[PDB]
Amino acid sequence: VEAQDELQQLKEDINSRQSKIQKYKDDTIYYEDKKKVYLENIKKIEVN
Amino acid sequence: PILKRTIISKRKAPSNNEDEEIVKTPRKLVNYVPLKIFNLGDSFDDTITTTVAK
Incomplete structure (x- = not known):
């Protein structure tokens, strides 16, 4: 029963962690989009 | 007298220049547009006077 409880809690935690990884990947994609917008602003400042 | 009141501007005459x-109207996040090629000055041309100095 202890092993079953540990396995279930670990499985839930790792599923949450994988979902945390996918949301972190989405957040990094959003950060990369913000960085691309900042680079576009930097290029406009550089041309000015 | 009349001259002072005519010269002075009533604060109520306009709507406080609203x-x-x-x-305030919104602006672009960078919107630098430096320009400013000429700051006042201008008037008499520099090339003609430079030739005159030569």
Whole structure:
């Protein structure tokens, strides 16, 4: 029963962690989009 | 007398020179547009006077 409880809690935690990884990947994609917008602003400042 | 009141401007005569729009109009996040090629000055041309100095 202890092993079953540990396995279930670990499985839930790792599923949450994988979902945390996918949301972190989405957040990094959003950060990369913000960085691309900042680079576009930097290029406009550089041309000015 | 009449001259002082005519020269002076009543604060009530205008609407305190109210601006357009309730809040300030929005602007672009960078919008630098440096320009400023000429700052005042201008008037008499520099090339002609430079030739005159030569």
